[PDB]
Design a protein around this ligand. Structure first.
Ligand SMILES: [Zn+2]
Ligand SMILES: [Zn+2]
Ligand SMILES: [Zn+2]
Length: 245
């Protein structure tokens, strides 16, 4: 997903997903300790810096190749042979974040948590779970798609407090892997012969530009909503693990 604005949801789907996930935790009145949301907000600047930094600097964006932002659950690889993938990377910052939290280093903690949330967010994007980059055919579709998502994301907010609590085990990799599995299953709802053909025609036809956007909307809504629920559960897991319990 997009992350073009550091502290604004406008063109930052990653921040939006995290924010909606936190909202889920807030709406939940039976399992969530609200002081957890209080901390996320207290250190929001760092959390957002972490979410944003993933796509703009090393080592996080892998020399502008973003290889660590992809993870195919079937072969466990990213799109570049031998490169680090989203599962191991998301887990990496999840742990570094927890370790800093225990050491009472809150800025360090939430910055790293932000990065981890970013990687978890990416595997919820079908293209990232299928190694479909902006260079994959049709090239350019990846970026155009994620930019489009920003114009409609607000129409798919989860409004209940039902996040996927304890969706997977205690290992963050299980959550990242699990999300990628579901995302990859929805891949054809975004990338198929139709959307490919229409996107190519969108170059010269406004009708086709609207046609591919329309076609991918239903699945986009599904992906966005699941991403919110999974992320909420992931955050809850983080606090349960390192929040002194
Ligand atoms: Zn992204
Ligand atoms: Zn992307
Ligand atoms: Zn990314």
């Amino acid at each position: 997903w997009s992350a073009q604005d550091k502290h604004k949801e406008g063109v930052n789907s990653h921040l939006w997903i995290v924010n909606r996930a936190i909202d889920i935790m807030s709406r939940n009145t039976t399992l969530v300790k609200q002081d957890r949301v209080a901390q996320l907000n207290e250190w929001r600047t760092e959390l957002e810096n972490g979410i944003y930094a993933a796509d703009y600097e090393n080592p996080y964006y892998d020399n502008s190749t973003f290889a660590s932002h992809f993870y195919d659950p079937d072969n466990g690889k990213t799109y570049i042979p031998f490169a680090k993938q989203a599962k191991e990377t998301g887990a990496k910052y999840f742990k570094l974040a927890g370790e800093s939290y225990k050491n009472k280093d809150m800025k360090q903690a939430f910055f790293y948590l932000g990065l981890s949330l970013h990687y978890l967010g990416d595997v919820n994007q079908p293209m990232h779970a299928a190694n479909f980059t902006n260079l994959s055919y049709p090239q350019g579709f990846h970026s155009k798609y994620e930019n489009f998502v920003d114009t409609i994301k607000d129409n798919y907010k989860v409004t209940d407090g039902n996040g996927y609590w304890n969706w997977k085990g205690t290992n963050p990799e299980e959550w990242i892997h699990g999300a990628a599995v579901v995302a990859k299953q929805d891949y054809s709802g975004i990338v198929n012969d139709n959307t490919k053909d229409w996107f190519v025609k969108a170059a010269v036809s406004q009708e086709y530009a609207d046609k591919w956007r329309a076609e991918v909307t239903p699945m986009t809504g599904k992906r966005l909503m699941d991403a919110q629920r999974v992320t909420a559960g992931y955050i809850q897991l983080w606090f349960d693990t390192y929040g002194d319990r």
